[PDB]
Design a binder for this molecule. Structure first.
Ligand SMILES: Nc1ncnc2c1ncn2[C@@H]1O[C@H](COP(=O)(O)OP(=O)(O)OP(=O)(O)O)[C@@H](O)[C@H]1O
Ligand SMILES: [Ca+2]
Ligand SMILES: [Ca+2]
Lengths: 364, 123
C-alpha cells in the first residue's frame, strides 16, 4: 500500500495534499522569491511575507508554466517543506490547464522523473477532475481561478478540445478592478498589503447582482446595499455598489475594457461548438469551479443568463458546490485513491523506456 | 485498467451491479439486486444481446442522497473506466435517487427499493 500525493498547480495558489484526504493539507501562493539586490530562495507564504527584501516571481501564467526553474523550486518546496515527504517514495498526480502545450506536458513529466525521481506520476486536466468531484461524467465546467477562466465541455469522461474556450479575465483582474473603483470612492489601495485588503474585501463583501441595472438603481437611490469594512488599524470604510460592480466584470468584460464575451456567453459558445446530440446534457450540468466562482449570487445569475440564451425548452442546471475552491484537488484525491489508479500512472520503468513523450499516450 | 471485476464485466446478457466501497468497485450479492443504500453509490451495467452476437451496454451510476463525495466521484470515474474497458461501447447514465430514468427503474422487475444507511466514506 503506497501513498499517492496530489498537487494542483494554480496561477495564484498551489494546492497540495495526500490522495485519500478530503482536502489539501497545504494551500499557498504560487510564488518564488529571491534576494532582490544580493536561504537562497523562498516559496509560498514565507516568500510573500519577506517581499521587503525579495523580488517575487509567479511561474504560472494563465494556468501555463512559463518558468521551469521557478516551478521546480515550487515543487521542491511542496514536497520537502509543505507535505514533508521524500518524493522518490510517492506516486504523484499533477493537474494541468486545459489545452496545456504538448511541450509543457513532457517537461512536467521529465522534471518529476529525472529531477525528483518519483516512482510514478499522472497528469489530469483540472476541469475534468472538477467534474468528477461533482459525481458526473458529462457536463460543462466553468473554471475561473486567479489568472484565467475556462469553459470545458466534457462528454462521458473526456473533455472536447475543439469546444474549450478561454476568457482571459479572472480573480486577479477582479481584485485589480476593485482596487480602481474603490479609489473613485476616495480609497487608495496600492501597496501589496493594501491589495490584500482589497482582495479580502472582494472575497468578503462582493456579490453578483441578479439584475445589474436594477441593482445600480437601488444603490443610487438608497443606502440599503452599503456595507462596512474594518481595516487592519481601525479605520472603517463604506462600500457601496462596488460590491457587485466588481464581479459584474465577469459578465461584462467591457468593464475592464476587454472586447471578449462574458462568462455566460463563453459557456453558451462552448456548448454550441459541441454536437447537437450532447448539448442537452451540457446545459443540464454546468459545473462551476475555482475561487472566482465563489461570489454569492453567481449560480443564480449564470442560470438566468444561460436560460436567456438557450431555447426555453432546454433545462438549465447550474451546479455550485460549496467546496468549489478545491474541487479540482478533491477530484484528484479521489482519482488517485481508486483501486484502479495503480495501472493508469506512468511508472519510472515506462519513463526510462519511452521518455517524456509517454505522457501523450498515457494521460489524455 | 484491468480490475478483477472488469474481467467479469459485460461478458454476457444480463445485469451486474457493484457498490463503491472505499475507493473500490465491490460486487453486490445477486440476492440483493434492487436494494439500494441511500448513503451509497453504485455502478450498474445492463448487457443486452445484439443481432450480430455482440452485446449492447448501458452503464448507470446510481447516487444515493446521502452518499459521500468520494463515493459519487468514484462511481463516476469507475463508469468512465468500465466504458473504456468495453471499447467505448457503453452509454453512460447518471441516476440520482428519486430521479432515476424509466430505463433504469425498468431493470428491476419487482421495483427497486431504498434503505437508509451504507458503508462509511473512504476519506
Ligand atoms: N469567496 C471568494 N469570493 C471571490 N473570489 C474568491 C473567493 N475566495 C477566493 N477567491 C479568488 O479566487 C482566486 C484564486 O482561485 P483559484 O485557487 O481557483 O485559482 P488558481 O488555481 O490559483 O488560478 P488559475 O486556475 O487561474 O490557475 C483569487 O483571485 C481569489 O481572490
Ligand atoms: Ca486553478
Ligand atoms: Ca456511503
Amino acid at each position: 500500500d503506497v501513498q499517492a500525493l496530489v498537487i494542483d498547480n494554480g496561477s495564484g495558489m498551489c494546492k497540495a495534499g495526500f490522495a485519500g484526504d478530503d482536502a489539501p493539507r497545504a494551500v499557498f501562493p504560487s510564488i518564488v522569491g529571491r534576494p532582490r539586490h544580493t536561504k537562497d530562495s523562498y516559496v509560498g507564504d514565507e516568500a510573500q511575507s519577506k517581499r521587503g527584501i525579495l523580488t517575487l516571481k509567479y511561474p504560472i501564467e494563465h494556468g501555463i508554466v512559463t518558468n521551469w526553474d521557478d516551478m521546480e523550486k515550487i515543487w521542491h518546496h511542496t514536497f520537502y517543506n509543505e507535505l514533508r515527504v521524500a518524493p522518490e517514495e510517492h506516486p504523484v498526480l499533477l493537474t494541468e490547464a486545459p489545452l496545456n502545450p504538448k511541450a509543457n506536458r513532457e517537461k512536467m513529466t521529465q522534471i518529476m522523473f529525472e529531477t525528483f525521481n518519483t516512482p510514478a506520476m499522472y497528469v489530469a486536466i483540472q476541469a475534468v477532475l472538477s467534474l468528477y468531484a461533482s459525481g458526473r461524467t458529462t457536463g460543462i465546467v466553468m473554471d475561473s481561478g486567479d489568472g484565467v477562466s475556462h469553459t470545458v465541455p466534457i462528454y462521458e469522461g473526456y473533455a472536447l478540445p475543439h469546444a474549450i474556450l478561454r476568457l482571459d479575465l479572472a480573480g486577479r483582474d477582479l481584485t485589480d478592478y476593485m482596487m480602481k473603483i474603490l479609489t473613485e470612492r476616495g480609497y487608495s489601495f496600492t501597496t501589496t498589503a493594501e491589495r490584500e485588503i482589497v482582495r479580502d474585501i472582494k472575497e468578503k463583501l462582493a456579490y453578483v447582482a441578479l439584475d445589474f441595472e436594477q441593482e445600480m438603481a437601488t444603490a443610487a437611490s438608497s443606502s440599503a446595499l452599503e456595507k462596512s469594512y474594518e481595516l487592519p488599524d481601525g479605520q472603517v470604510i463604506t462600500i457601496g455598489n462596488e460590491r457587485f460592480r466588481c464581479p459584474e466584470a465577469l459578465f461584462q468584460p467591457s468593464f475592464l475594457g476587454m472586447e471578449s464575451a462574458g462568462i455566460h456567453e463563453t459557456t453558451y459558445n462552448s456548448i454550441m461548438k459541441c454536437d447537437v446530440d450532447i448539448r442537452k446534457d451540457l446545459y443540464g450540468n454546468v459545473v462551476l469551479s475555482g475561487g472566482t466562482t465563489m461570489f454569492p449570487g453567481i449560480a443564480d445569475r449564470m442560470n438566468k443568463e444561460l436560460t436567456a440564451l438557450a431555447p426555453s425548452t432546454m433545462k438549465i442546471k447550474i451546479i455550485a458546490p460549496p467546496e468549489r475552491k478545491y474541487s479540482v484537488w478533491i477530484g484528484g484525491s479521489i482519482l488517485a485513491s481508486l483501486s484502479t489508479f495503480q495501472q493508469m500512472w506512468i511508472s519510472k520503468e515506462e519513463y526510462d523506456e519511452s521518455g517524456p513523450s509517454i505522457v501523450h499516450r498515457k494521460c489524455f | 485498467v484491468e480490475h478483477p471485476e472488469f474481467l467479469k464485466a459485460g461478458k454476457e446478457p444480463g445485469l451486474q451491479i457493484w457498490r463503491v466501497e472505499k475507493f473500490d468497485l465491490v460486487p453486490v450479492p445477486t440476492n440483493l439486486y434492487g436494494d439500494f443504500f441511500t448513503g451509497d453509490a453504485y455502478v450498474i451495467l445492463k448487457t443486452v444481446q445484439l443481432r450480430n452476437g455482440n452485446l449492447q451496454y448501458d452503464l448507470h451510476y446510481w447516487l444515493g442522497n446521502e452518499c459521500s463525495q468520494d463515493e459519487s466521484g468514484a462511481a463516476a470515474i469507475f463508469t468512465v473506466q468500465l466504458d473504456d474497458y468495453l471499447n467505448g461501447r457503453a452509454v453512460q447514465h447518471r441516476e440520482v435517487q428519486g430521479f432515476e430514468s424509466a430505463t433504469f427503474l425498468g431493470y428491476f422487475k419487482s421495483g427497486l427499493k431504498y434503505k437508509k444507511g451504507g458503508v462509511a466514506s473512504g476519506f
